[PDB]
C-alpha cells in the first residue's frame, strides 16, 4: 500500500504541477533549463519531506 500510495501521489502531483506551470507558456531558449530547475526543486522538496 505505502509504495503504491507514494507512487500515485508523486505522479499526480507532478502531472498537475507540470500541466499548470509549463503548458501554454512560451518555448523560449531557456525553457529546457527552467523546466530542469523546476523539476530539481520539486524533487528536492519531495526528498526533504
Amino acid at each position: 500500500m505505502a509504495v503504491g500510495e507514494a507512487n500515485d501521489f508523486l505522479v499526480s502531483e507532478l502531472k498537475v504541477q507540470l500541466e499548470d506551470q509549463f503548458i501554454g507558456t512560451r518555448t523560449i531558449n531557456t525553457s529546457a533549463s527552467i523546466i530542469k530547475d523546476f523539476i530539481q526543486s520539486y524533487l528536492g522538496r519531495k526528498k526533504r519531506d
Binding site: 531558449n29 525553457s31 529546457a32 533549463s33
Partner: protein
C-alpha cells in the same frame, strides 16, 4: 556617391595626331525600388 564603382585598371587612353581616344567603364548609380525577402521557418531542438 554619384556612381557606384569603376574598374580603374580598365581605363585606356590613346593619342594619335590630334585624336583624343578615350574608353572606360562605369557602374551606374541606382536607387532601390523592389525588395524580395525570402523568409524560411525552421524548428530548433534544445537540450537542457
Amino acid at each position: 556617391n554619384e556612381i557606384q564603382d569603376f574598374p580603374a585598371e580598365d581605363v585606356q587612353v590613346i593619342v594619335e595626331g590630334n585624336e583624343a581616344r578615350i574608353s572606360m567603364t562605369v557602374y551606374p548609380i541606382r536607387s532601390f525600388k523592389k525588395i524580395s525577402v525570402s523568409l524560411v521557418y525552421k524548428q530548433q531542438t534544445l537540450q537542457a
